[PDB]
Structure 1
Amino acid sequence: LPPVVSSLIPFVGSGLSFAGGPLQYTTDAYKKYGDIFTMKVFGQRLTFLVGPDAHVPFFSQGDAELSQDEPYQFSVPIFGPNVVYGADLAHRNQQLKFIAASLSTKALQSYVPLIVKEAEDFFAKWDKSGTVDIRDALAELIILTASRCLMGKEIRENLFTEVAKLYQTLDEGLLPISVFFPYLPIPAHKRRDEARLAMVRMFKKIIDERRANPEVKHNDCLQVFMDARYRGEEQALNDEEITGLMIALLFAGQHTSSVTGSWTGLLLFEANNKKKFLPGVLEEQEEIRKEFGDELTMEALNKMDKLHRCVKEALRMYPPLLFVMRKVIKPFSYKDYYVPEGDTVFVSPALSMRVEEVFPNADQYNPERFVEEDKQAQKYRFVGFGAGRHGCMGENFAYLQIKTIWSVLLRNFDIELVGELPKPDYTAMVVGPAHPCLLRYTRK
């Protein structure tokens, strides 16, 4: 035999995210076999859990029973060394607490004026009338807004173009092959590795300058991460870790929020949906303005229930992450069944939120379904943001970002969907509406 230079058997599960959106295939298997079933690929067992009952083992178990490490291995060379899914549990859990602190109610209270100002300025630059790719526009606004709230005023105001380009290069580094072989030495991965080091060099300058002026307070996630302490350690996080936590929140928060922001508009301003649901949403904006005035405050955004439900219903019908997945560390029972050590378990928010028994007329747009649904006591029915221990920590931020966007648009423009509702684009790990995603707008 000629020389064998390497022999690899990678974890296959993360591959589902780049399988071109096999929802109808998995739906067909659900309708035949029921709420728990297994596919084998190269002898690796992939076990699916559909609907609230089957969700319980997935969302109610913890790190000792279900592991994120294998599913999120792709992220380790993106976020950097000893960051989140590249850290041991002891450090990981502490880092997730620092992120929780940066996205708390208190933190959001301070971010909201910054979100509102970026949105108002952004849409104030629009022509009197025209046609816009809402997905391209909202991706632009959402990276501007995150550069301010996550990274702080220095980077937003001086280095936006530089930091946006570094992020773009990390985004371009995540290929299908990347989830099987995160360390494969290809050009896209070399560019990724250089872009991450370049970002660390950029944050090192801001951090060093902030510590040289420790009286100067900052309303950003960077300040929370600079103040952060590991238990029984006086030394702060190093620059690589602080930078890694930023990149993690860009990956968590950018495409998810911009695709959900985009579907919110494309669905609501579709001719039939617009006739039914727009009047209520416009009425709500008037009632909000009568009670609170014109300032978009935390308090006023929190009262926009009908707009909130329009976002939630876009997320129900077109979740940006088709799968969440865990490696099974400890076997468990679900009803009559046994799920063995070594299985990969999946929940598809896409599948689970088209279950008729949970969501009647699941393929119909009906944001007012959530008046009744929000009263239901049964856990894990709506799983757009996941659930349980590793449930989305950005949920409240996401709702404030998207409701701010559509508040500013609804108050200032008449909007129509151009042509047919876009179909989902299943080419990346975040699913969004296929370009072109055109809305026609006219100032009021």
Structure 2
Amino acid sequence: KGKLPPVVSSLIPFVGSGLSFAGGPLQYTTDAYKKYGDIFTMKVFGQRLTFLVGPDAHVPFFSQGDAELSQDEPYQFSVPIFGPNVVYGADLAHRNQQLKFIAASLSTKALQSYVPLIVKEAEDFFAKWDKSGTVDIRDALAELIILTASRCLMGKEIRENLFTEVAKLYQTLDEGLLPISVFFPYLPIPAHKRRDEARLAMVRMFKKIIDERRANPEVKHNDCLQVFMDARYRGEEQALNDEEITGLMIALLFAGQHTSSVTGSWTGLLLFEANNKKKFLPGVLEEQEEIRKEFGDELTMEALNKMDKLHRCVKEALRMYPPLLFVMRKVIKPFSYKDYYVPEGDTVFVSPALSMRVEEVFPNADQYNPERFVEEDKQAQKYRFVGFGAGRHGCMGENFAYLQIKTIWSVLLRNFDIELVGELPKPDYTAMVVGPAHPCLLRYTRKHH
């Protein structure tokens, strides 16, 4: 020992926190921070869960690598969803390579030639609205992101032919992921048997396409799938098999939908809220106008990357309502932070939500102020904002996401007047995909296309 961080109280034998933590996750971890500060521990059926709040506290979590902090135990729910030997079900030698291949397929070189695809989809999608009306922005953006992701991740075969079949197989997999599924990933309920069956179907679907492509050698494709098909395990001629390629597909597909789709929605919902509109919208519209002068009606990456004021509106919707509540590692080598000592065996927690609501980090943290990031971007200290994580395993889609969300909102900002229906949605912290609560409504008054 050295000094163990404060165990959070509870009078209920054996379960301890558990019942209070599940149902109230953000609220309970938040009250723990006020009671026990920076770093604290929850016992639930004798599992120590140590929590880290604020930049000083994050440093043990994001600095250490794989032989000091492991991802496999607390991300085991992913394994039957993605498949055997995929990502967190893969041995570190095999995993980090796959993670390298994922990085290639979402690199700035790859993302340049995805932007046209991203833009076209966004544009064809929003064309098909009326002169006027009212949508659920969450639903709408959810539809579009899977649709473009279908093309960018999976290819155009899958896009033009097989989309609604894929959108079906996916809906199953998100339906085989319940609270219960994170605790017992292979529990033989029906939802998991649908899921297990779906995943096996999606493998067979991608079998069709890879056979096709290898029988037509020279025809070039521009998608993630093509990168994965040409990925090769170091030393080994080996080369990924079909079951593995789908897993990565399924993994990235999931990413789009569990996160891009919800901050996507948040950005708009927050921007077009009437006090947040009266202050931060004009600045964004003048930004579009000044970008249109330099580049024209076209959206290219070059244009999108200059959209700094909008970029911030996205980054602030991520600061306030980040889609993933916890990131997690089981501790291998023990470690120290302040006077305290975290021992081998504990699962350590960081809460993007909570750490980004800390006053001494973000002054006025309950307020929407995108332009807080003008000075924040200059700050020296690592790990203040954590929406996309950090370190050896920070997000690899952060560019892709900012791109896709900006595309959506540029295309929307330009072609429509938008207004928030009713008052701002509450967040759904106690749900599987932590979004805004329906009805997430926007009235659209079009203007002059």
Q: State the TM-score, normalizing by the size of structure 2.
A: 0.95
User: Structure 1 3/305 Cα, relative in aligned 2: closer, same or farther at 3 Å?
Assistant: closer
After TM superposition, the runs of 4+ consecutive aligned structure 1 residues lying more than 6 A away are 1-18
Cα deviations by residue, 1:298-336 (Å, 9 ceiling, x for unpaired)? 000000000000000000000000110110111101010
Shift of the alpha carbon at 1:43?
A: 1.4
Retained in 2: the 8 A contact 1:38–1:45? yes
CA shift at 1:407, angstroms?
Answer: 0.1
Cα distance between partner residues in 2 of 1:189 and 1:163: 18
Q: Give the Å deviation of 1:251.
A: 1.7
Displacement of 1:427 in angstroms is: 3.8
CA deviation string 1:388-422 (max 9, x = no partner): 11101000000000000000000000011011100
Cα distance per residue 1:268-304 (max 9 Å; x no partner): 0001000000000000000000011111000000000
* 1:8 positional shift: 23
Alpha-carbon deviation of 1:180?
A: 1.0
Deviates more, 1:374-383 or 1:248-257: 248-257
Q: Per the alignment, in what secondary structure is the counterpart of residue 17 of structure 2?
A: helix
Decide whether the 8 Å contact of 1:122 with 1:141 is kept in 2: yes
Gaps of 5+ in 1: none
Aligned to 1:56: 59
Deviations 1:338-361 (A, max 9, x none): 001111110001110011111000
- 1:7: Cα distance to partner? 25
1:24, distance to aligned residue in structure 2 (A): 2.9
Question: 2: distance between equivalents of 1:46 and 1:119?
Answer: 42
Do 1:15 and 1:179's aligned partners in 2 also have CA atoms closer than 8 Å? no
Q: Flag the 1:4–1:385 CA change in 2: closer, same or farther, 3 A.
A: closer
Q: 1:415 to 1:193 in 2, by over 3 A?
A: same
2:272 is aligned to 269
Give the superposition deviation at 1:214: 1.2
Cα distance, 1:21–1:213 mapped onto 2, change above 3 Å = farther
Aligned equivalents of 2:432 and 2:61: distance in 1?
A: 21
User: Could you say which residue in structure 2 is the equivalent of 1:77?
Assistant: 80
For structure 2, the residue ranges without an aligned partner over 5 or more in a row are: none
Q: Which residue of 1 aligns with 2:369?
A: 366
Q: Distance in 2 between matches of 1:101 and 1:263?
A: 28
Q: Tell me if the contact between 1:296 and 1:404 (Cα under 8 Å) persists in the aligned partners.
A: yes
Q: Is the 8 A contact 1:83 1:92 kept in 2?
A: yes
The range that moved more, 231-240 or 53-62, is 231-240
Q: 1:263 to 1:12 in 2, by over 3 A?
A: farther
Instruction: Kindly provide the CA deviation profile for residues 170-217 of structure 1, in whole angstroms up to 9, marking residues without a partner as x.
Output: 110001111111111110011001101110111011001101111001
Distance 1:348 1:306, change over 3 A: same
For residues 57-85 of structure 1, what are the alpha-carbon distances to aligned partners after superposition, in whole Å with 9 as ceiling and x for unaligned?
00001111111101110110110111111
The 2-side partners of 1:2 and 1:301 are apart by: 45
Asked if structure 2 preserves the Cα contact closer than 8 Å seen for 1:114 and 1:149, the reply is yes
Cα–Cα, structure 1 residues 96 and 285, in superposed 2: closer, same or farther, change >3 Å?
Answer: same
- For residues 16 and 79 of structure 2, what CA distance do their matches in structure 1 show? 16
Distance change >3 Å, CA 47–CA 2, structure 1 → 2: closer
User: Offset of 1:17 from its aligned partner?
Assistant: 13
> Take 2:75 and 2:5, find their aligned partners in 1: how far apart are those partners?
35
Superposed CA offset, 1:6-40 (max 9, x none): 99999999989992343232222212221011111
RMSD: 4.9
Distance 1:61 1:26 in 2: 23
- Alignment map for 1:40-439 (pairs within 5 Å): 40-439=43-442
How far apart are residue 252 of structure 1 and its match?
A: 2.0
Rate the CA distance shift 1:384–1:331 in 2: closer, same or farther, 3 A: same
Kindly indicate whether the alpha-carbon contact (under 8 Å) linking 1:12 and 1:180 is maintained by their aligned counterparts in 2.
no
- Structure 1's 253 and 422: CA in aligned 2 closer, same or farther, altered over 3 A? same
Q: 1:436 to 1:4 in 2, by over 3 A?
A: closer
**Higher mean C-alpha displacement, 250-259 vs 372-381:** 250-259
Q: Is the 8 A contact 2:116 2:300 kept in 1?
A: yes
Q: Is the CA contact 1:38–1:47 (under 8 Å) kept in the aligned structure 2?
A: yes
Deviations along 1:110-153, whole A, 9 cap, x unmatched?
Answer: 10000000000000000111110000000000000100000000
Q: Deviation per CA, 1:200-245: give whole Å up to 9, x if none.
A: 1110110011011110010100000000000121132110001111
The answer (yes or no) to whether the contact 2:425–2:437 under 8 Å persists in 1 is: yes
Distance 1:29 1:249, change over 3 A: same
Q: Quote the offset at 1:250 in angstroms.
A: 1.3
CA contact (8 A) 2:26 2:429 kept: no
Residues 25, 430 of structure 2: 8 Å contact kept: no
In 1, the alpha carbon distance for the partners of 2:420 and 2:312 equals 19
Give the 3-state SS of the residue equivalent to 2:12 in structure 1. coil
Shift of 1:2: 42
Aligned counterparts of 1:4 and 1:370: Cα–Cα separation in 2: 35
Tell whether the 8 Å contact from 2:52 to 2:350 is kept in structure 1 after alignment.
yes
Cα separation, 2, equivalents of 1:4 and 1:335: 16
Q: Give identity over the alignment, percent.
A: 100
Does structure 2 conserve the Cα–Cα contact (< 8 Å) formed by 1:10 and 1:181? no
Per the alignment, in what secondary structure is the counterpart of residue 14 of structure 1?
A: coil
Q: Deviations over 1:415-437 (max 9, x none)?
A: 11011100011243320000010
Aligned length: 444
Give me the TM-score of the superposition, normalised by structure 1: 0.96
Q: Please say if residues 137 and 442 of structure 2, whose CA atoms lie closer than 8 Å, have aligned partners that are also in contact.
A: yes
